[PDB]
Short mmCIF file of C-alpha atoms in Angstrom, two decimals:
data_model
loop_
_atom_site.label_atom_id
_atom_site.label_comp_id
_atom_site.label_asym_id
_atom_site.label_seq_id
_atom_site.Cartn_x
_atom_site.Cartn_y
_atom_site.Cartn_z
CA UNK J 1 95.81 -70.07 -52.29
CA UNK J 2 93.12 -69.88 -55.06
CA UNK J 3 90.53 -67.62 -53.73
CA UNK J 4 90.24 -64.39 -55.79
CA UNK J 5 86.75 -63.82 -57.45
CA UNK J 6 85.46 -61.04 -59.64
CA UNK J 7 83.07 -58.48 -58.05
CA UNK J 8 79.62 -60.05 -57.28
CA UNK J 9 80.97 -63.63 -57.37
CA UNK J 10 81.26 -65.75 -54.16
CA UNK J 11 84.24 -67.95 -53.46
CA UNK J 12 84.13 -71.61 -52.36
CA UNK J 13 87.34 -73.62 -52.33
CA UNK J 14 89.12 -72.99 -55.76
CA UNK J 15 85.85 -71.80 -57.57
CA UNK J 16 83.90 -68.53 -57.92
CA UNK J 17 80.03 -68.71 -58.13
CA UNK J 18 77.41 -66.31 -59.45
CA UNK J 19 73.83 -66.71 -58.30
CA UNK J 20 71.87 -65.21 -61.07
CA UNK J 21 68.24 -63.91 -61.23
CA UNK J 22 65.87 -63.32 -64.04
CA UNK J 23 63.63 -65.74 -65.97
CA UNK J 24 65.61 -67.82 -68.43
CA UNK J 25 65.30 -71.07 -70.28
CA UNK J 26 68.30 -73.37 -69.99
CA UNK J 27 70.21 -72.27 -73.06
CA UNK J 28 69.60 -68.60 -72.24
CA UNK J 29 71.17 -69.25 -68.74
CA UNK J 30 74.05 -71.00 -70.49
CA UNK J 31 74.85 -67.82 -72.57
CA UNK J 32 74.20 -65.51 -69.47
CA UNK J 33 77.11 -67.51 -67.81
CA UNK J 34 79.28 -67.48 -70.98
CA UNK J 35 78.96 -63.72 -71.41
CA UNK J 36 80.11 -63.17 -67.75
CA UNK J 37 83.20 -65.36 -68.54
CA UNK J 38 81.71 -68.29 -66.47
CA UNK J 39 79.64 -71.41 -67.28
CA UNK J 40 76.58 -72.97 -65.81
CA UNK J 41 77.75 -74.61 -62.51
CA UNK J 42 79.30 -78.16 -62.46
CA UNK J 43 78.97 -80.02 -59.14
CA UNK J 44 81.63 -82.54 -58.13
CA UNK J 45 81.41 -83.10 -54.28
CA UNK J 46 78.96 -83.04 -51.30
CA UNK J 47 80.82 -80.01 -49.86
CA UNK J 48 80.32 -78.03 -53.07
CA UNK J 49 76.63 -79.10 -53.08
CA UNK J 50 76.14 -78.05 -49.46
CA UNK J 51 77.61 -74.63 -50.33
CA UNK J 52 75.30 -74.26 -53.31
CA UNK J 53 72.13 -75.43 -51.32
CA UNK J 54 73.03 -72.70 -48.68
CA UNK J 55 73.22 -69.82 -51.38
CA UNK J 56 70.81 -70.79 -53.97
CA UNK J 57 67.22 -69.60 -54.74
CA UNK J 58 64.41 -71.37 -52.86
CA UNK J 59 62.37 -71.41 -56.07
CA UNK J 60 64.87 -73.56 -58.17
CA UNK J 61 67.89 -72.91 -60.49
CA UNK J 62 69.37 -74.13 -63.75
CA UNK J 63 72.64 -76.00 -63.35
CA UNK J 64 75.14 -76.97 -66.06
CA UNK J 65 74.03 -80.56 -66.51
CA UNK J 66 72.23 -82.15 -69.58
CA UNK J 67 71.26 -85.49 -71.06
CA UNK J 68 73.67 -84.76 -73.94
CA UNK J 69 72.97 -88.01 -75.96
CA UNK J 70 69.26 -87.97 -74.99
CA UNK J 71 69.79 -91.64 -73.70
CA UNK J 72 71.05 -90.98 -70.06
CA UNK J 73 74.60 -89.83 -70.70
CA UNK J 74 74.44 -86.79 -68.47
CA UNK J 75 77.42 -84.48 -69.10
CA UNK J 76 78.31 -81.00 -67.49
CA UNK J 77 78.76 -78.00 -69.80
CA UNK J 78 82.57 -77.98 -69.22
CA UNK J 79 82.65 -81.64 -70.62
CA UNK J 80 83.13 -83.26 -67.20
CA UNK J 81 81.25 -86.46 -66.29
CA UNK J 82 78.92 -87.14 -63.33
CA UNK J 83 80.92 -88.53 -60.44
CA UNK J 84 79.08 -86.93 -57.51
CA UNK J 85 75.23 -86.90 -57.98
CA UNK J 86 72.42 -85.37 -55.92
CA UNK J 87 69.29 -86.62 -57.74
CA UNK J 88 65.84 -86.21 -56.18
CA UNK J 89 63.78 -89.58 -55.64
CA UNK J 90 62.97 -91.07 -59.05
CA UNK J 91 65.53 -88.94 -60.97
CA UNK J 92 66.73 -88.81 -63.71
CA UNK J 93 60.94 -83.80 -66.50
CA UNK J 94 63.03 -84.03 -69.77
CA UNK J 95 66.72 -83.09 -70.95
CA UNK J 96 68.12 -80.23 -68.90
CA UNK J 97 68.84 -80.29 -65.10
CA UNK J 98 67.60 -77.97 -62.40
CA UNK J 99 68.44 -77.73 -58.68
CA UNK J 100 65.44 -77.42 -56.26
CA UNK J 101 65.54 -75.21 -53.06
CA UNK J 102 66.51 -78.46 -51.33
CA UNK J 103 69.60 -78.65 -53.53
CA UNK J 104 68.28 -81.90 -54.95
CA UNK J 105 68.37 -82.30 -58.85
CA UNK J 106 65.71 -83.10 -61.33
CA UNK J 107 65.25 -83.30 -65.07
CA UNK J 108 63.22 -80.53 -66.67
CA UNK J 109 62.16 -79.40 -70.14
CA UNK J 110 64.97 -77.19 -71.56
CA UNK J 111 62.48 -74.48 -72.64
CA UNK J 112 61.00 -73.98 -69.18
CA UNK J 113 61.84 -70.53 -67.84
CA UNK J 114 63.30 -70.61 -64.30
CA UNK J 115 63.85 -67.54 -62.19
CA UNK J 116 67.36 -68.49 -61.02
CA UNK J 117 70.66 -70.00 -62.44
CA UNK J 118 74.16 -70.49 -61.10
CA UNK J 119 77.53 -69.80 -62.82
CA UNK J 120 81.03 -70.98 -61.79
CA UNK J 121 84.60 -70.12 -62.87
CA UNK J 122 87.90 -70.88 -61.37
CA UNK J 123 89.20 -68.57 -58.64
CA UNK J 124 92.39 -66.72 -59.46
CA UNK J 125 95.41 -67.34 -57.36
CA UNK J 126 97.85 -65.18 -55.31
CA UNK J 127 101.44 -66.16 -56.31
CA UNK J 128 103.56 -67.69 -53.38
#
C-alpha cells in the first residue's frame, strides 16, 4: 500500500501529484518542482493520463518531457523514455512539452510562460 502524500499533493496509484499555478517558463517550472522535492510530471500509462486530464488546468500545463538531443529523442526529467504517448495531431512548437486542457501533448518554446505546471513524486508506503 503506497498511498501517503505530503499536504497539498493528490495521490494516484503509487505517485503523488502537485497541480501548480503561477506563470513560469519550462525550466522555472522544473525548479519549482525540484524545490518541493518532486519533479515535473512523467506520464507512463493511459490511466495516469486520464487522472491528469481530470485534475489539470484547462489553460495548459508544463510536463516533464523535452526533446533532449534536439533531434526527436524525447526524454522525461527523471531520465525515463517515452513508452506511453498522448501527442496531439501533427505532434511532435519547439523543445519543451506542454499538456493542453484536453490532456493531449504538444511541443512548445521552452521560454513561453504557462499559467500551470504539474509535479510528481513517489507516494510513501505504510509498512505491512
